[PDB]
Ligand binder design. Structure first.
Ligand SMILES: [Mn+2]
Ligand SMILES: [Mn+2]
Ligand SMILES: [Mn+2]
Ligand SMILES: [Mn+2]
Ligand SMILES: [Mn+2]
Ligand SMILES: [Mn+2]
Lengths: 201, 201, 201, 201, 201, 201
């Protein structure tokens, strides 16, 4: 997991010309003020008018510099009815979270040696789930109203590997002959899928 | 931080006669069922009729065996008006959390080389805070109704070192001559403090 | 990464009734013999007559018990002409590898904050590549003869999340309405994809 | 624990205008000289004429730049007769130490799930003790002459959270209503305690 | 082991005047190009016309900046007939490797509590070995033609402590009276050994 | 470094038939008694009437079960006049230590990329030194009376790789043709060296 901190605080210096290191350099401690350990960025719902029908509001180190070196971050995800936070992976963190409003089908997938088992259930207000680092998972709003969840991670920068977007809409996209071989369908089907993700999100 | 996992899942075997290891041994994977990655233990408010005026509902590995080896846990804390989650430390984890209802004065204290600085603010619904591993911190309900927060940690077993209870009500209590020297007050004052914590909580 | 070792050697006890822990318990050191630090399991090519046209020969702790606690493993991957080791992720390890024979298009994909960038090139005998933990990647045999590579990981059990198989052929498969929403295509297309992975591999 | 080193040596650059990172940047290796792996800072006793009756002489990375990245530090603590190194916590390290002269009552406190157990004994010359990261502990000179101990930590910067000073004399102090609720005594008692720590140490 | 990465990529900035940190600072991500995850440095055999009769071709972070923060590296070692990669230690990594051509006697030595056991066998093409961090080991070409192996490590900078060269040819060499006491032979024998390593390699 | 602890205490179960894991299983916490965090094993000097002229008194987890999982250990080393703690390596820990009595030449050696630099000085009572994990180092008593030092490590089981004993007296010894090639001397010289270490210490 993230390297442990070597002092109490180390607020990220996010200036575009800052020297680059693993993670982030820190602003001078003397200059951090009083408020770096607090945020209000998750107070409002994200805009669910997206192709997925969900919206992630990030609270990782990029959005909350006071988390730098501390080995934690958060996010909020809002869902339109029938919206999905699509199959995805966090490459660098375990996730733990709670549904706050509505009803979400939450699915978590084992790796090959676990038989690619799918564990899923309908998670309601106050109920929680845990997703091991690197494993594919999704949420789907099965309710008829807006749902949201609040999640936390054991990294300052868990990363998101969105499976559909990466598979079909990477920069630039994976070669069609790779995808036809991998997906066991003809070029036309792969081309249809790519056309859905050609817009970068 | 907690050792990284060496497989997808490793549900804690919490049987009283289980062999003991760092953390917990795991139940046979073949026998875990479908539901170990989920919990509903935080759906209900804790009982705030306590001397502190707060109640912690734990969701660490002892309460959620499916978190074993995954490097995360959660808790809910409910507060009566004027209730406090008193100055305390988590010896093995950074904490990250959100106020869900009400208004909480949240205070976080730097260590000696940080001048023992106190950072505090009133945290309201949807607002968040982060507390580095090992640092003293508290919350106090400044509202006139019940408040609660939901918190997460980057350990399966963060630990709680309650400062008042440990200082005055440990098992058995710290010697009075140690406390008079350390607190710079006479025996009578130390004896008064001990009398408040003689009941073990 | 994997927990560091706390002694020189700790050969995995892979008996089916062994107590379960994070990773593996160890056989009594006194009884390990001379040969646990060696293997010959990668001397022979895997069978490439598979739907993917590739075959992975594993040398993780399950196949090489002497690697237990040491934070490393290996594998060999053989490729028929036009064969692919399809888009996949190792949830718990960085991979580093070398092409030994033939010509492989090797592609490595950044996460969302890296713009899902695809980095790819044709890798020939003696040439190497590195794949950060948790990131999607693939190889495709662009040559007209059999190719193989030998790879190593900084985990005893890196895991494999095969993207096509997990997305369409998990146990049981992800719900069609989740996949239609996530992939932005009609049910018929999702059903076609599922039919290709209904056999478990 | 502290991040492992990625090279042999990395002597801390402690210049006030140095770029800030987790831990410390390093001076150019070419310029470190011969003597960075050695110190003589603990050769002399600290001044025990303090309110606590003890004096800590630090040998962390701030005082010994050659320890930077190496995951270790030291300190010496000297005690007047009846002096205490008061209840405190090291947020980022386990401590291991030896009494060198005199007789010290050494107390170590478990966390809540350990029942806040107090383990204590009189430790004499050559005898040792170990204090897990984050746990409250103290020493008290029970002898009639000066005592000292030498301690080591598995961090370059373990931190010190002094319980009395932080509880009553932080910068600025914890609110009286928080302390009256937490300590179960009236304002007058809290005000008396604060008056003892108003001087910053 | 090496600190985990806190982002996808962090290509090492190896400029001689770069600020120094544990490991390496990184070049601006925006400027890394496409090719940093690939190398061709191990395509050619090293020059075995050396006193050892072996040649190490390094592929650590100094030679492959794209490995920075990723916790892995590689090397190739080529051997003349009768050549040795002499008893040595990697202070910061476990090694895992495969013989590619020829026949190598590979020996791995336990530490004191393992009775300094020597485990050795003749390793041929395709066969593998694993060497725990910090343990002494060697390879010796027992064949009549050139051999080579390709090895990987779970560090970006494993380090090499060559035992003969360090014992007899360090900068400056270990004092003769230290070596006579340690090796239980007279000065003349130590002086003979030093004369063989006076050239720095 | 050693895996972090997942609870307050975990006293090692050192029974010969205990299940084996990375490190040690723990005795039931309920049964540990009061005294596991303390030891008196270093109160007395070791017997310096040895070929080296030094004696190591170990206080690792094998000798101090209460250190299990806590990431620290200690040792005492006593030296006859002219005695040496010979060139050796700790494979799994950084060492930090203090001379308590007498005068010791302490030498610490960089790895290859550090030019195999030797850093050495005469260390007297109260003076300290630090030795990075995996690096060769030695001490030599330059005084005319007995010296001793007390050292600590950031591992519960640092290991000791004694260079002379391992090079010449391993179990069984390294082949003579390996040593003649590696040491650049004739068989007779290697045979002389082996004869000095044929007794196992
Ligand atoms: Mn997620
Ligand atoms: Mn807390
Ligand atoms: Mn792969
Ligand atoms: Mn302390
Ligand atoms: Mn090697
Ligand atoms: Mn040593």
């Amino acid at each position: 997991s993230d390297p442990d901190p070597l002092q109490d605080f180390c607020v990220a210096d996010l200036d575009g010309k800052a020297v680059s290191v693993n993670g982030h350099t820190c602003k001078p401690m003397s200059e951090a003020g009083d408020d770096f350990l607090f945020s209000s960025k998750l107070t409002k719902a994200g805009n669910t008018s997206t192709p997925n029908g969900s919206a992630v509001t990030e609270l990782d180190v990029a959005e909350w510099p006071g988390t730098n070196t501390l080995g934690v971050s958060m996010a909020r995800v809002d869902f339109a009815p029938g919206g999905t936070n699509p199959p995805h992976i966090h490459p660098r963190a375990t996730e733990i979270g709670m549904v706050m409003k509505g009803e979400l089908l939450v699915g978590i997938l084992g790796s090959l040696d676990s038989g690619n088992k799918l564990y899923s259930r309908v998670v309601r207000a106050g109920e929680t789930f845990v997703i091991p680092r690197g494993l594919m998972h999704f949420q789907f709003n099965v309710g008829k109203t807006e749902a949201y969840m609040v999640v936390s991670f054991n990294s300052q920068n868990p990363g998101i590997v969105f499976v559909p977007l990466t598979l079909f809409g990477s920069d630039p996209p994976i070669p069609t002959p790779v995808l036809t071989k991998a997906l066991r369908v003809e070029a036309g089907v792969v081309e249809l899928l790519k056309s859905k993700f050609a817009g970068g999100s």
